[PDB]
Structure formats: C-alpha cells, structure tokens
Amino acid sequence: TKCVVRFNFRGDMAVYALKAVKDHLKKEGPHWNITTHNDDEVYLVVRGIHESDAKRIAKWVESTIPGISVETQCD
Amino acid sequence: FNLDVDSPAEYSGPEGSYFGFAVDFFVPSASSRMFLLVGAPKANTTQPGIVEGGQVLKCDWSSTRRCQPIEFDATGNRDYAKDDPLEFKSHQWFGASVRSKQDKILACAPLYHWRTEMKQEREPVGTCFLQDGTKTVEYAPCRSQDIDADGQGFCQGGFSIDFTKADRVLLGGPGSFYWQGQLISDQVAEIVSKYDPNVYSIKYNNQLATRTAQAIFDDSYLGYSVAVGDFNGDGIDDFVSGVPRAARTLGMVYIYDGKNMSSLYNFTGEQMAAYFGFSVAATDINGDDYADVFIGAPLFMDRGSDGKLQEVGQVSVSLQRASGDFQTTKLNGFEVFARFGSAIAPLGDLDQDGFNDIAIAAPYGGEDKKGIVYIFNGRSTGLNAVPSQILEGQWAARSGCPPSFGYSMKGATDIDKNGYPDLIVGAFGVDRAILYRARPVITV
Ligand SMILES: *[C@@H]1O[C@H](CO)[C@@H](O[C@@H]2O[C@H](CO)[C@@H](O[C@@H]3O[C@H](CO[C@H]4O[C@H](CO)[C@@H](O)[C@H](O)[C@@H]4O)[C@@H](O)[C@H](O[C@H]4O[C@H](CO)[C@@H](O)[C@H](O)[C@@H]4O[C@H]4O[C@H](CO)[C@@H](O)[C@H](O)[C@@H]4O)[C@@H]3O)[C@H](O)[C@H]2NC(C)=O)[C@H](O)[C@H]1NC(C)=O
Ligand SMILES: *[C@@H]1O[C@H](CO)[C@@H](O[C@@H]2O[C@H](CO)[C@@H](O)[C@H](O)[C@H]2NC(C)=O)[C@H](O)[C@H]1NC(C)=O
Ligand SMILES: *[C@@H]1O[C@H](CO)[C@@H](O)[C@H](O)[C@H]1NC(C)=O
Ligand SMILES: *[C@@H]1O[C@H](CO)[C@@H](O)[C@H](O)[C@H]1NC(C)=O
Ligand SMILES: [Ca+2]
Ligand SMILES: [Ca+2]
Ligand SMILES: [Ca+2]
Ligand SMILES: [Ca+2]
Ligand SMILES: [Ca+2]
Ligand SMILES: [Mg+2]
C-alpha cells in the first residue's frame, strides 16, 4: 500500500552516496516523493512507497552503496 | 615508592613485532604457577601464508625468563568458496588487546578483516579468541549480519576489553555505526557453549549492547577504552566507557548500568582536543567502598601566567559519593609533550596502607623521550596529586619510534607472592616488556 523509508548517509562519501541512491530511486520511481537534506545530517526520505518497494530499494542499496542505514516504517 | 627499579625482570620479542604493546597476567585458579601475557601484534607466525599476523606470548617468570606463543589460531585464512578467501589474518594485530581472568584468556585482533557473505569486501570487524580449560573458541560479537560502516563492519571489536566479576565479557568496538562506538557485553558460558566453527555469525541469548544514535554522535569512538565497577550499589559491576572525541571533541566518559545498559552518569572534559577519555579506570581510591573514576586527557594544554600554553597532559579524578554525586579534582602533567595520562593502571593497594594506589604514565617524557611512569598514592581524601615514584625507560629508540615506556601497563597482580601487587610495563618501540615487583613496606 504505502510506507515511509529513510536513508541516513554518513562519512566523506555521504554526498556521492546520496546522489547514487537518489538517481536510482528517480529511475525506479519517477513520481515518488523523494525528499533530501544536506544540512548537517545528510538523509533521504521516500514517502508513499508501495510497501514491497520498500524492501526492493533497501536490497538494491545493500548490494551496491556500501553502508547506508535504512529505516522502514509501515502501518 | 616501593617498586624495585634496580633489578627488574626484562623480557623481549622478535625485532619489529611490537612485543610489549599490550600486557596482562595469566593466573589459573589452581596451577600453582603464574605467567605473564605479552602481546606482539606484528609478530611473524607459522600460519600458512600469514604475514605479521601477530601473536600472544606466554612468558614465564620463576627460574629463567623465556617467552613462547600461544596457539590460539594454528591455521590460515579459511575459504568461503574456491579461490575466494573468507578472512584476512595478515596484519590483523592479534595480541594488541589481551585480558585474562583465572584460566580464561581473551586475546583480540582489532585489525582483523573479513568479507561477509552478502558481498566480497575487506571489513575491519575485529575478532577475539577465548581460551579456557582445554578448549578454544572464537568470539566475534561484531561479526554479524549488520555489516559495513553503518553496522558493525568497522567495529574493530576487541579494541578494548575487560572482564566483569559476574563472568561477563565487556568489549569496546569504537568503530561501530560510523564511529559512534558500541559496547557489547556477553556471558562466558554463552560464548564457549554456543560455538560452531562452521558458523561465522553467532547470536547469544544473554547479550547486552548499546545502540546506534543520531549523526550528532558520529566519530565519537565510544568504547575506545573500557573499565568496570559498581556505580549504583546493585552488587553488579557497571560499565565505564571512554568516548574521546565526544561533545565537540571535549571528550566524554559514559557509565552504563551493568544489568540492562541504562545510562547512569556523564563526565565531560573542559578543553578541546585534550582527548579526554583516552583512557579510563574504575577503582576505590579513598576506601569508601564506592568505585571512583579516573579519566585521562593526554593532550591537555596547561596555560601559564603569561598566557603561553604548554602541552603536558591531564588526569581527572572523581570520587563517588553515596548520593550518586561525584567530587572532581584535577592532576596536571609535569613535562611538555610527554602526554601524561595516556595510560592509567590501578595497582591495587601497592603499599598496603588501606588505600588503593594508581600508576599514570607519560610515554614520551624524560631524557631522549624514553618514557616515564608516575606512581601516585591514594588516601581518604582522594588521590594525592604529588607522585611518590618515578620510573624511567632504559632504552634508546632504534628505528624512529620511541620505546614508549609506559604505553601499556597492568598491575594489581602479585606474581612473587609477597602480598604486594606487582606492575608490568610495556615498551613496544624497542620490542620489550618489563616487570617491576613491589617491595614490602616497613613502618617504624
Ligand atoms: C549521557 O549523555 C548521552 C548523550 O551524550 C545521553 O544519551 C542520549 O539520550 C537521548 C534522549 O535524552 C537520546 O535521543 C533520543 O531519545 C529518544 C527517547 O525518547 C525521548 O526523546 C523523544 C524526542 O522526541 C521524546 O518525545 C520522548 O518523550 C523522550 O523524552 C529515542 O526514541 C531516540 O531514538 C532515535 O533513533 C531511533 C532508532 O531506531 C529512531 O527509531 C527514533 O525515531 C529516533 O530517531 C531520531 O533521529 C532520526 C534521524 O534521521 C530522525 O529522523 C527521527 O525523527 C528522530 O529525531 C533517541 O535515542 C540519544 O540517542 C542518546 N544518545 C546516546 C549516545 O546514548 C544519556 O541519556 C546521558 N545519560 C545521563 C545519565 O545523563
Ligand atoms: C615478517 O616477514 C616479512 C616478510 O619476510 C618481513 O617483511 C620484509 O622485510 C624486509 C626487510 O629488509 C623488506 O625488504 C621486505 O620487502 C619485506 N617484505 C614484505 C612482504 O613486507 C617483515 O619485516 C617481518 N616482520 C617481523 C616482525 O619479523
Ligand atoms: C535497569 O534496572 C534498574 C534497577 O533499579 C531500573 O531502575 C532501571 O529502570 C532499569 N532500566 C531499564 C532500561 O530497564
Ligand atoms: C607581571 O606584571 C603584572 C602586570 O601586568 C603584575 O600584576 C604581576 O604581578 C607581575 N608578575 C610578577 C612575577 O612580577
Ligand atoms: Ca577521513
Ligand atoms: Ca551496578
Ligand atoms: Ca570511592
Ligand atoms: Ca596504598
Ligand atoms: Ca609482589
Ligand atoms: Mg572529506
């Protein structure tokens, strides 16, 4: 249905990782509510992800971009 | 004032091995004889294809003075798949961190790397070998499904370890969660019982641990150095952990509940980049039955009357009171760039006067930066700020690196069986370790 997934980017490559994840998400979900923040703590949040899509993107990130902390909250 | 520095017992290892980097004592409950445990993290082992793997040596004491390696790990790198290694033991720094309780020896390798099953990589997870009885098991609490920098992949578990009187292992892993740091505490019985050599990730039932927090805590290195003692009166040793880069690099020391990890206390340094929390210790220094907290800050700069700042190092001493309040005083170093307070080692009641005493080192002080160890006596009002004895390093640097006498110390163990606990001091820059024994004190 709908969930919220948050990705926390840390370290010297945090902004490269943010770009890599953001570009991936834009291609997988061109109309997803993708919000990013580069202020002090770098993170990306996707709202309205279609539930199963939350695991699909988390798996892609785990197997690609080294270490992004992902939190999934579903109702 | 009672250490014998005229006729010390000196031990050495292979050149370039950093023998003496870390020291402890090995005292089986009923063997009648005791051994010294001296690490040598860059030693060349006999393992099939391992370079500078590191080793722990069991050094004797009575009769002659010889050291031999302990075969905690007699093999090389296990494979995950054909022509695809599971682990990387070369340059793992095994023996960098060693602690023992009775017949239980816990020896760690903070630079051990492995690939994990999910992807091929080289993550500095850190592993420990626990040997007791006639059995050896591998303990690797940061080797799990929670991997890479956001997980425990860069934990370097075993960086700092201790034992809880409850027969639990306290392990500091400063690299967890993008260097926020993590404390992990488990039971010896679980570690030894739940062992299977075909399982890389092992879960335990009675394990306690800290958790990941907000990015504002990144690069704090919690669990850089750990200690234990009772700070709430529950009869259960609690956990003391240095966090040297915390609070805008002022440095902090955290105390957690030894039963459920709830936070109990917070100590904060005063000066930025003094690296407060580099080393911590917990001991009763005033005879009040309440553990007191000793916090090192080796890069501390002491400003003089003309406004000039001298880097000497500082140690903060806080006494625990029954109310839960702490009474804090400060002790400054004596020599510039000696880094006083970098190593703190409780000696127990060194002079048998009823109050515990403590050793504080300054590894780069003295003539030619040989290194100095200062002995400070206790009393009913807290630590006496004036040192009673000065121990100087006896060796010249041979290859750039100072002998760093006093870099690593351990006391409160009586090897010569005279009632007065002895002190073992490492000097890895010259591949040596030296044992100073405590003399009887005669009052007239
Ligand atoms: C010694 O000093 C240490 C710190 O140096 C101190 O520990 C810190 O304690 C604070 C709490 O005081 C921890 O901060 C958070 O605590 C809440 C618990 O609930 C309290 O705060 C909320 C705030 O809204 C109140 O509503 C509530 O009533 C309580 O007062 C936790 O729930 C927080 O958890 C976060 O991480 C979780 C991971 O799963 C998330 O699921 C959760 O949503 C929180 O995420 C936050 O960050 C996200 C970043 O993207 C953000 O998106 C979320 O919206 C949210 O903001 C959190 O723990 C702090 O972490 C502790 N730090 C450390 C290192 O332990 C000790 O207490 C102190 N001890 C003594 C004796 O003084
Ligand atoms: C452990 O063995 C290695 C390999 O024999 C030693 O490293 C060599 O040291 C010589 C010193 O002249 C160098 O010329 C070689 O290039 C080094 N080889 C490698 C692969 O590094 C190492 O010094 C030995 N360490 C100890 C403590 O004995
Ligand atoms: C830990 O145990 C003490 C026992 O007095 C209790 O007061 C405290 O609330 C407990 N904390 C947690 C997190 O369970
Ligand atoms: C140095 O000069 C200041 C005045 O600027 C004075 O207060 C201080 O006592 C003098 N110190 C000594 C040792 O003379
Ligand atoms: Ca860097
Ligand atoms: Ca307790
Ligand atoms: Ca006390
Ligand atoms: Ca004493
Ligand atoms: Ca003795
Ligand atoms: Mg940078």
Side-chain half-sphere CA neighbours of B416 within 13 A = 17
Question: Tokens at residue B119, please?
Answer: 């992807």
Structural domain spans, chain B = 9-436
Rounded to the nearest whole angstrom, what is the distance from the C-alpha of residue B306 to the centroid of ligand 4? 9
- Which protein residue has the closest C-alpha to ligand 2 atom 3? B51
The residues that bridge with B402 in the sheet, in sequence order, are none
Exposure class string for A43-74: b at 16+ Cβ within 10 A, else e:
bbbbeebeeebbeebbeebbeebbbbbbeeee
Nearest to B149 among A41, A42, A66 (CB): A66
Provide the residues around ligand 6 (an ion) whose CB is within 5 A: B 232, 234, 236, 238, 258
Q: Which ligand has the shortest distance to the CA of B307? A: 4
Residue B438 DSSP class: B
- Which protein residue has the closest C-alpha to ligand 1 atom 48? B214
Q: What is the SS3 assignment for B107? A: strand
CA distance B75 to B308: 55
Q: Which ligand has the shortest distance to the CA of B437? A: 9
CA distance A2 to B97: 49
Rounded to the nearest whole angstrom, what is the distance from the C-alpha of residue A68 to the centroid of ligand 10? 17
Q: Which ligand has the shortest distance to the CA of B422? A: 9
Angle at A43 between CA A37 and CA A44, to 5 degrees: 90
Q: Are the beta carbons of B433 and B11 closer than 8 angstroms? A: yes
Residue B86 DSSP class: S
| CA terminus-to-terminus distance, chain B | 16
CA distance B404 to B432: 10
Phi, psi of B384 (to 5 degrees): -75, 120
Greatest Cα pair distance in chain A: 35
Question: DSSP strand E in A10-57: where?
Answer: 33-37, 42-49
Side chain identity at residue B431, one-letter code:
D
Residue reference for tokens 């351990």? B410
Q: How far is CA B119 from CA A65, B86, B201, in A?
A: 11, 11, 15
Residue reference for tokens 């306290």? B170
Residues counted in chain B: 444
Q: Within a 10 A sphere around the Cβ of B385, how many other Cβ atoms?
A: 12
Residue B389, H or E segment: strand B389-392
Which candidate, B309, B315, B273, B284, places its Cα nearest to that of B297?
A: B315
CB contact under 8 A, A10 and B151: no
Alpha helices in B174-330 (DSSP H): 176-179, 188-193, 246-249
Question: Tokens at residue B67, please?
Answer: 């050291």
CA distance B180 to B212: 7
CB contact under 8 A, B212 and A66: no
Q: How far is CA B46 from CA B83, B234, B394, in A?
A: 21, 47, 31
CA distance B254 to B295: 11
Resolution stated for this PDB structure, in Å: 2.9
Exposure class string for B301-317: b at 16+ Cβ within 10 A, else e:
bbeeeeeeeebbbbbbb
CA distance B12 to B159: 23
CB contact under 8 A, A67 and B215: no
Angle at B77 between CA B73 and CA B83, to 5 degrees: 160
CB contact under 8 A, B150 and A40: no
Given the candidates 3.40.50.10490, 1.25.40.10, 3.30.70.600, 3.30.160.270, the CATH classification of the domain at A3-74 is 3.30.70.600
Q: What is the SS3 assignment for B10? A: strand
CA distance A30 to A12: 28
B182-187 vs B343-348, strand pairing mode: unpaired
Burial of B442 (0-12, 13-18, 19+ CB in 10 A): exposed
Phi, psi of B180 (to 5 degrees): -80, -35
The pick from B210, B262, B265 for probing ligand 3's pocket by mutation, whose C-beta has the most ligand atoms within 8 angstroms, reads B262
Which residues in chain B are contacts of A40 at CB distance < 8 A?
215-216
CA distance B276 to B229: 20
Cα B395 to chain centroid distance, Å, stands at 24
Mutation choice for B interface testing from A6, A8, A9, A10 by most B CBs within 10 A: A10
Axis crossing angle, helix A14-28 with helix A52-62, rounded to the nearest 10: 140
Which candidate, B397, B396, B427, B421, places its Cα nearest to that of B409?
A: B427
Torsion angle, CA of A49/A55/A59/A65, rounded to 10 degrees? 40
Residue reference for tokens 């578990």? B157
Rounded CA Rg of chain A:
11
Which candidate, B297, B320, B317, places its Cα nearest to that of B357?
A: B317
Nearest to B150 among A10, A40, A42 (CB): A10
Give the method of determination: cryo-EM
- Please identify, by atom number, the ligand 3 atom nearest to the C-alpha of residue B261: 13
Residues counted in chain A: 75
Residue reference for tokens 């090897």? B415
CB contact under 8 A, A41 and B215: yes
Residues framing ligand 2 (Cβ under 6 A) = B 14, 16-17, 42-44, 51-52
Q: How far is CA B171 from CA B151, B225, B254, B389, in A?
A: 16, 9, 14, 32
Q: What is the SS3 assignment for B195? A: coil
The residues that bridge with B172 in the sheet, in sequence order, are B160, B183
Chain breaks in chain B (C to N over 2.5 A) after: none
CATH architecture entry for B9-436? 7 Propeller (2.130)
Residue A54 DSSP class: H
CA distance B435 to B431: 14
CA distance A9 to B442: 63
Q: Which parts of B are annotated binding residues for Ca(2+)? A: 230, 232, 234, 236, 238, 284, 286, 288, 290, 292, 349, 351, 353, 355, 357, 414, 416, 418, 420, 422
Phi, psi of B330 (to 5 degrees): -130, 145
Q: Are the beta carbons of B235 and B258 closer than 8 angstroms? A: no
CB contact under 8 A, B214 and A41: yes
Side chain identity at residue B327, one-letter code:
Q
CA distance A5 to A51: 10
Structural domain spans, chain A = 3-74
Residue B109, H or E segment: strand B104-109
Q: Within a 10 A sphere around the Cβ of B405, how many other Cβ atoms?
A: 32
Burial of B102 (0-12, 13-18, 19+ CB in 10 A): middle
